[PDB]
Every structure is written in structure tokens, then in C-alpha cells.
Amino acid sequence: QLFCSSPKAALRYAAVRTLNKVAMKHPSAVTACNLDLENLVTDSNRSIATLAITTLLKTGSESSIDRLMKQISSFMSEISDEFKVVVVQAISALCQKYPRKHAVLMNFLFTMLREEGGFEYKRAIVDCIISIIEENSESKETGLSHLCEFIEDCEFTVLATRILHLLGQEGPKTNNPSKYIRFIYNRVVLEHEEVRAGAVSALAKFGAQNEEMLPSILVLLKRCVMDDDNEVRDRATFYLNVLEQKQKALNAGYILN
Amino acid sequence: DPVYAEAYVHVNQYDIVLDVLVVNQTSDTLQNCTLELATLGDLKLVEKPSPLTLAPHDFANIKANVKVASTENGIIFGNIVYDVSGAASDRNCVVLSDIHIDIMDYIQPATCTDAEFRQMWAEFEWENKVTVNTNMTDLNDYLQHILKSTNMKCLTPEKALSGYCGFMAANLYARSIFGEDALANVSIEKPVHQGPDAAVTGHIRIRAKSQGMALSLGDKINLSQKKTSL
Amino acid sequence: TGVQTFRRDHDRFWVLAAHPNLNLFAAGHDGGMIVFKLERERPAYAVHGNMLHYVKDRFLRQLDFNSSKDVAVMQLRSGSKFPVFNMSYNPAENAVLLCTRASNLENSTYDLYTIPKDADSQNPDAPEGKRSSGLTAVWVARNRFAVLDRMHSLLIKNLKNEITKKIQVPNCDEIFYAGTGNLLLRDADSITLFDVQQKRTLASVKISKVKYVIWSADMSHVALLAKHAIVICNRKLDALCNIHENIRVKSGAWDESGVFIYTTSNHIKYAVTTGDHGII
Amino acid sequence: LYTVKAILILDNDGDRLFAKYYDDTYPSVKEQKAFEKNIFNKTHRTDSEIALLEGLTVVYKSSIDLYFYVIGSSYENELMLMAVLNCLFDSLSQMLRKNVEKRALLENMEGLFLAVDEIVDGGVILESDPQQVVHRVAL
């Protein structure tokens, strides 16, 4: 291991990923730190960069060291053998070991993710979001809180599409209504007939279910918030008109499915 | 010292004017030191009552007009060192840097077409935000208070309802005395029994060209936001 | 003797200096230079008739009254001088209790001194002079229990008297190992009230300190210090008003319980009385 | 082992002046270029100690004038694999008395060609050392 441990066989990287599998046994694990530390340290050799992500991963890590690394990464990731790709792979692994779970990490990560950024996070996001859903994460209030905020000022319409769709289903099973509303309004706030539109669509699963306060008000709201701009007008009118057209209880049932 | 000089600033209409009491409760028009002029920011200090006696047991009003539209000095937030000198019946004096020079006031409200606005909102110097969350009031009275305090604009309502909740995001715009336009969208919960608002957890998104003033503005407003022991 | 070597670059220098103002201290080099500033940010006190006692953050005495430009109070009640862990009035217009050799040790010395005449260590014979060993001595709430450290950890000190030097291991209760607080706050973020042993809280109130609680002279001031901010209470938590300023340096004063003096430039002001506010 | 997807000697203008898809199952001269593009553009004369693309081994090299590509699968160890790649530079160098150049390339292709078939033939590397060759060849 040691012998290889500097690109004798730049081969060594692959192995840790699976070929020579690692998920350890407890004292055994402690022993592993040094080797990973060499790669982690070296930061070079395409073969090295990859190695850093697998070794570290497989063996796992303490919180603390991560911290040091976050800075290291800050420079590193952009190109440092074209770190970004290895990293996205690494990242895909990150989303998996913590896909909205160790949410504190998820958030730390989140802050960092957005932050270290470039832009290249977005790609990652496609995975990350997916991970969070896989868990069906429960520190959403927070998780969501970070997402919501950051995304707002972390942009990209495209992300929104995906997330929207998901969110679209979820609504009042996870409550926190005022906040969630609070968000929702914001999401719409943005221009784009299109951006605006999603908040209403997500809402249908939601509305229908209602939450810790919603049905009365649910009825009140569509009224309170209303829009022209023709086809944007139309969207308000139509949803309404559609609304207009079925007993809203029935309405909800057919449409939702 | 007998000579006690007390002074504060009065800014009376553009003009930041210096109230000075030099009271020379001195035992004589004690000799006085020295003072120096300077370019300032979009202001320049510009007057000194000439004499340098510290007339006995005597009280005096020393006025400094400042010139309020010129003298660029880019020492932001002011806080620039200033001198009153020890140069005559005086061994020392006060050298001071100012503090007390803040924004909330400066900017005036200013206005926009909403579509264009949105487009713009996004478009602007994104780079600053601060959060609203926490107070002592509803954002009716609270909002009004803040508004008046900064002398700045919220551009437009949609009736959705700043009342039943609202679940309203308020867009604010202002233009200042040396002309920066600053844009906000703050999106906010809003007071109402067991519905929502006695905090916010609304985010104040601040755009002003330099982040440094801009964020600082978000702060400044943050100071503004509430009402407590300065 | 060579204490220690300190390394921080510059393999090339020719000057060192300590101020003859003594303000600051600095070291000069080829590659460049550094200035460092000293403070025992915030530092200990005692009151005796119409006189203030200080223990320097930086700077010597200034332990009451003045005469020309600035005067560090040099008296037989040496305040800002010694190697302080803690200083507390042992009320008398004639007594103080003082820990010296400060710091972390197993334990330090405290030599408690008489205002009539302090000493290197005052008399163990005298009970306004006593010294013994002990690391720190600290106030705690519901006012007569005290903490003494006389092990490098939690001794409780409790006496009716505040000419007090009492030793009490009972109330051993770590879960916070020897550190700093003064109505108990190993950054409790609360002032927590107790007796002389207990393994069950009487109670804690959530409020906070400069890491000192200010008593109106002796040991009963509901006027509170907070590190930045200070709060005015009457005795115990009654938040009367709460002070804040934002200069991370100075002070404001109470005459007794909550008499609010504030300093205001070249003007010195009473923040408030009866329904009044004034520049004296 | 019927393992060469192609071995290409590419210019570093993304051009290819040699390609043999020893083995192939994807096509298009275009797609070949495209495929080429993503990776080449990306590696851009830069190479890596190792590179894996597609779970597949990419051993590629650069010269001082030319870019060497071999595509294979990460499913067959570097050391050998490289050895062939090594063999490619070296013999050409010695024999010719000169290694690859753009110039060299331009004057005549053939020798490369001659060599290539000998060394490798499809997805099976028949050989990877010069000497045998050196005697064997006499052109």
C-alpha cells in the first residue's frame, strides 16, 4: 500500500473505491489515517486526486479534519488536475453518506457547496437533492431552510424546476406552514411567468391536503394573490377558472391525480 | 478644565454643523491652539471662528459649518481623524476620528415599473443581504417606523394583505444625496395571533454597489430595525 | 535565565524596543515589524470610602482621586500592580482580600491585606492580613456563599463574613473543571445560586455577567456588569433597564444600586434620577 | 486481448492522423471526432499519469510534438498497458534514431503503420518490447 502510496501504480486509487473495498472494522480504521493523509496532503496526480476522495471516504473522517480540508478544497477543486470531476464523483458519494442526513454536515456542506462553488455545484445538486429525498429527510425545516435561502442567491432556474416538481408533491405532510408559505411567495416573487407558475402547481397537492391552518384560508389566498399579464393573467384566471369549473373538493381530487 | 468644551453635532439640513461649546471657564482668554481645514467627503469642512483666546469664565459658541455636497474623501462611514490641537494654552487636545456617521438617513425613497423592476432586481449588485427576524411590533407600525427612519421607499403593494398574515414580500427602493440607488426585496412572515409574525425570518436582500457599503447598509438597517439601548 | 524562545520569522533583525512611554511593545526586523498591545481585559476591584480600586487590564493603579494629567493610584492598597487572580473588597474602609501568583497552578497564595497598611503578605496573625494558599476566590449568588478554589478546583467558600477566606471541598461538583465565573458562570450564561455542598440546583436564572456581578459597594449590587453591555437591575434579576453602547472599552458608573452615570465626551453625565437626567 | 478500442495518434490540434480502431463497436468519423473532442479538448496536450475515462482505461500520452491515445478498459493493469505505450515511443525513437515529431509525421506515415501492425493487431497485443522487432524489421 505504502509501496504504491506514491504513484508507483497510480493504480492504487481505483482499488480503494471498491476493488479493494473499505468500510472497515473499528480499531483497524484508526490505523488508516496516515496513508490517506499522504494523498490528502499531496493534492496532486490525477491518480492522486481520485485517491484522495476514495480513501478518505472509505475510511471515513472526523468532522474536524473536514474543516481544514474545506479550505484546501476551496482552492483545489476548480482545476488541480481538474479536480471538479473527481470531486463530483466524490460529491455524489457525499450526498449518499449524508444525503440530507447528518444535516448539520449537510448544511455545513451546503454553505460550503454553494460557496466554494464555481458554479459546478449545480450538477452536484441534481444528485444532492435526490439524496435528500432518498432519505426522505426530516431536518427539512433546516435543510429546506438552507436550500430555500441559498437557492435564493445561488440562482439557476433549472434547479427550481426539479425541486419544484418534488416539492409539489410533498407539502403539508411536513408542516411549518407560515414559513413554507413565506418561502413560496418568494419563489413566485421572481419574474417569470414560469417561476411564478410552479408555486401554484406544487400547491395543488398541498392545498388539497391543507395543513395546521389551511383550508379556510386556502380558499381565501387564491383570491388575495391574483395576476394579469394576459397569459400570466390567464394563468391566474384559468386556474381560477378551472377552480371555478369544479367543486373545489372534487376539483382537487381529479386534478391531483 | 474650567474651560470645558462640550460639543456635539447637529446636522441641520444638509449641513452638518458643529455645535461647539468651548466654554472657557478659564481664568483668561487662555491662548489657543490650532485647527486645520480639509477636503472632506461630499462635504468639506469649511469654517472656523478665527480667534484663539479662551476668554475667562466665559462661554463660546464655536460653529463649524461643514460643506455638505463636496470634498471627496473616501474614508467611508466617515470615521476619519480630525484635529483640535494642543497648540497654545494646550499641551494636548483632542484628536479624534469620527464615528457617528451613518447611512439610514441619507438615502431618500425612490421608485420603479415592476416588471422591469423584477428584472432589474435580479440584475442589480446582488451582493449583500441581511435578515430580518426579530422586534417589538408588527411590521405595520414597525415597517412604517423603519421606513420613516431611513427615509426610504417600498415601491408597491398587492393586496394580499399585510393583515390576515400577509405573506407579503415588499420591495423597496431608495435614491441618495450622492445618488446611489439601492434595491430590496425583503420577504417577511408578519404578526397575527396564532398565524404568523413576531420575528420574521424574512430575509432582507440588500443590493448596493459596493458590497461593503451595501451589507453595511443591511446592518445599518439592522440597527434601524429595532428599538433598544444604543 | 532563558525562559523561552519564541519564533515568528525574520531571520534578520537589529532592534527591539519597549516604550519609554511604556505604552506598547514592539520588535523590529529586516523582513518587517510587529506591535502588540497588552490588557487583562477587564481587571479586579475593592471599595473603601470615596475611593476606587482598580487592577490593571493594562496600566498601573488609578485607584482614586487625581491631580494634573493622569494619576495611577499608588497607595497601601496596591491594586493594579500585583499578579492577580482575584480581588474583592472585604468591606471595612480598612480591609481587602487578594490572590496572587494569579494564574493556573495547583494553588496560588492569597495574601489578604489591611488598608491601614498592606504588605508582601500581611499577618496570618492579623485577620485583616491573613494569607494562605488557594488558587482563586469567587462570589456566588444568594449572597454569602462563595467559592474558593483550594485545590485547583471547586471549593466553596462560605461565610457570613466577607472577611472571608473559607475553604470548602463539599460542593465538589465539576462538570466544569477549574476556570472562570463569579455568580457561577463557567460561561453558564446564568448566575446560579447555591449553599456549601448540594448535588441538586437551588436554581439558576438566565441573565449574564461581565463575568462579574456588580454590587453596590460590598456584595449586594443588582447593578450588573456584562462584558459588552451591562444591565441595571436592582438586587437580583429585575431588569430595570438594560444598558448598551458599543465601544468595546470603557465604563459608566453606579453610585450604589443603580445610580446611572454615564460618561459623555468632555461632558460627564447622569443618565438618570427620580424622573430626572443631568450633566453634573 | 482484443482490447484496443483504438489506438490513435492524434495531433494535439484534436486531429488524428492515426487511428486504428482495433476493436470498435461505435462509429462515425464525426462521433469519433466528437468523442475525441470531449476528451482531447479537455486533456489538451495535457495528459495525466493515469486516466480512466469511461471506467475504461485511457492511456494516453503526449510527446514533445504529438498526442498519443490508446483507449482500453480499466479492466487491465497500467503497468503492462503503459509498457506497450512506452514501447511505442521508444522503439520508434531508437530505430529511426528519432522519436515522433509533427515533422516526422509529416514526412512519412508508413513506418508507424508498419510498426503498429506488428505490435498490436486488433484487441490483442501480440507484442510490447522493441528488440525482437528491431531485428525482425529491417525496412
In A79-118, the residues whose Cβ lies within 8 Å of chain D are 81-82
Contact D49 A14 (CB under 8 A): no
Residues of chain A with Cβ-Cβ distance to B129 below 8 Å are 153
- The identity of residue D8, as a single letter, is L
SS (H, E, C) B6-27: EEEEEEECCEEEEEEEEEECCC
β-strand partners of C278:
C270
Contacts 24+ apart (CB under 8 A), D13-19: D14/D40, D14/D41, D17/D105, D17/D109, D18/D109, D18/D112, D18/D113, D18/D116
Q: Name the resolution in angstroms.
A: 15.0
Q: In angstroms, what separates the C-alpha of A95 from chain D's closest C-alpha?
A: 21
Angle between helices A83-97 and A121-135 (to 10 degrees): 10
For residues B167 and A221, what is the distance between their CA atoms, to the nearest angstrom?
Answer: 10
Contact B55, B32 (CB under 8 A): no
Q: Which residues of B188-219 are buried (b: 16+ CB within 10 A; e: fewer)?
A: bbbbbeeebbeebbbbbbbbbeebebbbbbbb
Specify the DSSP element, H or E, that contains B151. none
Other CB atoms within 10 Å distance of the CB of residue A233: 13
Angle at B53 between CA B48 and CA B58, to 5 degrees: 100
DSSP calls for D36-70: HHHHHHHHTT---SSEEETTEEEEEEE-SS-EEEE
Among the listed residues C167, C162, C170, the one whose alpha carbon sits nearest the alpha carbon of residue C195: C170
Which residue on chain B is closest to C267 by alpha carbon?
Answer: B6
Which runs of consecutive H residues, i.e. helices, occur in B35-191? 114-123, 141-150
Choose the mutation target among B128, B132, B139, B165 for the interface with A, i.e. most A CBs under 10 Å. B165
Using only C-alpha atoms, what is the Rg of chain A?
A: 23
C-alpha cell at C49: 470610602
Q: Which residues of C81-108 are buried (b: 16+ CB within 10 A; e: fewer)?
A: bbebbbbbbbbbeebbbbbbbbeeeebb
Between the alpha carbon of residue B196 and those of residues A143, A146, A202, A222, B192, the distances in Å are 21, 20, 21, 18, 6
On whether any CB of chain B is under 8 Å from the CB of A178, the answer is yes
Among the listed residues C259, C258, C184, C273, the one whose alpha carbon sits nearest the alpha carbon of residue C222: C258
Scan for cell 490593571, then name that residue: C56
* Neighbours, chain B (3 or more CB pairs < 8 A): A, C
On whether any CB of chain D is under 8 Å from the CB of A9, the answer is yes
For residues C212 and C224, what is the distance between their CA atoms, to the nearest angstrom?
Answer: 8
Q: In angstroms, what separates the C-alpha of A24 from chain B's closest C-alpha?
A: 43
Phi/psi of residue B158, each to 5°? -130, 135
Contact A182 B196 (CB under 8 A): yes
Between the alpha carbon of residue C36 and those of residues C7, C29, C32, the distances in Å are 15, 15, 14
Q: In angstroms, what separates the C-alpha of B32 from chain C's closest C-alpha?
A: 17
Contact D50 A82 (CB under 8 A): no
For residues C247 and C251, what is the distance between their CA atoms, to the nearest angstrom?
Answer: 10
Which 3 state secondary structure label does DSSP give C8?
A: coil
Residues of chain B with Cβ-Cβ distance to A186 below 8 Å are 169, 187
DSSP calls for C130-198: -EEEES-EEE-BTTSEEEEESSSSEEEEE-SSSS------S----SS-S---SSS-SS-SSEEE--SS-
On whether any CB of chain B is under 8 Å from the CB of A190, the answer is yes
Q: Of A11, A14, A46, which has the smallest distance from its Cβ to D48's Cβ?
A: A46
Cα distance from N-terminal residue to C-terminal residue, chain C: 54
Contact B167 A149 (CB under 8 A): no
For residues C114 and C129, what is the distance between their CA atoms, to the nearest angstrom?
Answer: 6
Scan for cell 499641551, then name that residue: B91
Specify the DSSP element, H or E, that contains C5. none
Contact B230 C244 (CB under 8 A): yes
Contact A47 D49 (CB under 8 A): yes
Residues of chain C with Cβ-Cβ distance to B230 below 8 Å are 244-246
Query: Which method was it determined by?
Result: cryo-EM
Other CB atoms within 10 Å distance of the CB of residue C190: 18
Do strands C223-225 and D6-10 pair parallel, antiparallel, or not at all (unpaired)? unpaired
For residues A61 and A204, what is the distance between their CA atoms, to the nearest angstrom?
Answer: 43
Contact C252, C246 (CB under 8 A): no
On whether any CB of chain A is under 8 Å from the CB of B167, the answer is yes
Which 3 state secondary structure label does DSSP give C262?
A: strand
Q: In angstroms, what separates the C-alpha of C234 from chain B's closest C-alpha?
A: 18
Phi/psi of residue C52, each to 5°? -95, 140
Phi/psi of residue A83, each to 5°? -60, -30
Between the alpha carbon of residue C43 and those of residues A167, C39, C115, C210, the distances in Å are 56, 9, 19, 10
| DSSP code at position D76 | S
| DSSP code at position C226 | -
Residues of chain D with Cβ-Cβ distance to A88 below 8 Å are none
C-alpha cell at C204: 439558576
Among the listed residues B90, B97, B45, B81, the one whose alpha carbon sits nearest the alpha carbon of residue B66: B45
On whether any CB of chain A is under 8 Å from the CB of B118, the answer is yes
On whether any CB of chain A is under 8 Å from the CB of B187, the answer is yes
Give the number of beta-carbon pairs within 8 Å between A and D.
Answer: 26
Contact B212, B191 (CB under 8 A): no
Residues of chain D with Cβ-Cβ distance to A7 below 8 Å are 49-50
Contact C122, C110 (CB under 8 A): no
CA B5 remoteness from chain centre: 25
Other CB atoms within 10 Å distance of the CB of residue A1: 10
* Neighbours, chain D (3 or more CB pairs < 8 A): A
Among the listed residues B103, B108, B116, the one whose alpha carbon sits nearest the alpha carbon of residue B174: B108
β-strand partners of C133:
C109
- The identity of residue D94, as a single letter, is Q
Among the listed residues D51, D1, D47, the one whose alpha carbon sits nearest the alpha carbon of residue D22: D1
Among the listed residues B230, B204, B228, B201, the one whose alpha carbon sits nearest the alpha carbon of residue B218: B204
Contact C156, C145 (CB under 8 A): yes
Contact B5 C241 (CB under 8 A): no
C-alpha cell at C146: 462563595
What lies within 8 Å, CB to CB, of C110 at 6+ separation is C97, C98, C99, C100, C131, C132, C133, C134, C137, C165
Residues of chain D with Cβ-Cβ distance to A11 below 8 Å are 50, 77-79
Residues of chain A with Cβ-Cβ distance to B127 below 8 Å are none
Using only C-alpha atoms, what is the Rg of chain D?
A: 14
DSSP calls for A154-201: T--HHHHHHHHHHHHHHGGGS--HHHHHHHHHHHHHSS-HHHHHHHHH
The yes-or-no reply on A/D contact (3 CB pairs or more, < 8 Å) is yes
Specify the DSSP element, H or E, that contains D112. helix D110-119
Contact C244 B6 (CB under 8 A): no
On whether any CB of chain B is under 8 Å from the CB of C242, the answer is yes
Contact B126 A153 (CB under 8 A): yes
- Sign of the torsion angle spanned by Cα atoms A125, A126, A131, A136: positive
Among the listed residues B198, B203, B185, the one whose alpha carbon sits nearest the alpha carbon of residue B131: B203
On whether any CB of chain A is under 8 Å from the CB of B168, the answer is yes
Q: Of C243, C267, C279, which has the smallest distance from its Cβ to B229's Cβ?
A: C243
Q: In angstroms, what separates the C-alpha of B65 from chain C's closest C-alpha?
A: 21
Last residue before each break in chain D (C–N > 2.5 Å): none
Among the listed residues C131, C126, C127, the one whose alpha carbon sits nearest the alpha carbon of residue C82: C131
For residues A128 and A106, what is the distance between their CA atoms, to the nearest angstrom?
Answer: 10
Which residue on chain C is closest to B96 by alpha carbon?
Answer: C265
Contact C96, C55 (CB under 8 A): no
Contact A178 B159 (CB under 8 A): no
On whether any CB of chain B is under 8 Å from the CB of C229, the answer is yes
Among the listed residues B147, B44, B34, the one whose alpha carbon sits nearest the alpha carbon of residue B86: B34
What lies within 8 Å, CB to CB, of A71 at 6+ separation is none
Contact D78 A9 (CB under 8 A): yes
Other CB atoms within 10 Å distance of the CB of residue A207: 22
Give chain D's contact residues with A (Cβ, < 8 Å): 42, 48-52, 74, 77-79
Among the listed residues C238, C240, C268, the one whose alpha carbon sits nearest the alpha carbon of residue C252: C268
Angle between helices A157-170 and A140-151 (to 10 degrees): 150
Which 3 state secondary structure label does DSSP give C4?
A: coil
Describe chain C by its helix, strand, coil percentages, rounded to 5: 0, 35, 65
Scan for cell 485517491, then name that residue: A51
Among the listed residues C246, C253, C205, C213, the one whose alpha carbon sits nearest the alpha carbon of residue C228: C246
Among the listed residues D64, D71, D83, the one whose alpha carbon sits nearest the alpha carbon of residue D32: D71
- Sign of the torsion angle spanned by Cα atoms A132, A134, A135, A136: positive
On whether any CB of chain A is under 8 Å from the CB of B115, the answer is yes
| DSSP code at position B177 | T
Contact A11 D52 (CB under 8 A): no
CA C34 remoteness from chain centre: 30
HSE-CB of C101 using CA atoms within 13 angstroms: 15
Q: In angstroms, what separates the C-alpha of A114 from chain B's closest C-alpha?
A: 14
Which 3 state secondary structure label does DSSP give B229?
A: coil
| Cα dihedral value D44, D47, D52, D56, nearest 10 | 80
Q: Of A186, A189, A191, which has the smallest distance from its Cβ to B119's Cβ?
A: A191
On whether any CB of chain A is under 8 Å from the CB of B201, the answer is yes
Instruction: Tell the burial category of C136 from Cβ atoms under 10 Å away from its Cβ (0-12, 13-18, 19+).
Output: buried
Contacts 24+ apart (CB under 8 A), D100-109: D100/D9, D100/D63, D100/D65, D100/D66, D101/D63, D101/D64, D101/D65, D101/D66, D102/D11, D102/D65, D102/D66, D103/D65, D104/D65, D105/D9, D105/D11, D105/D17, D105/D65, D105/D66, D109/D17, D109/D18
For residues A17 and C162, what is the distance between their CA atoms, to the nearest angstrom?
Answer: 69
Specify the DSSP element, H or E, that contains A229. none
Residues of chain C with Cβ-Cβ distance to B94 below 8 Å are 266
HSE-CB of C180 using CA atoms within 13 angstroms: 11
Q: In angstroms, what separates the C-alpha of A145 from chain B's closest C-alpha?
A: 10
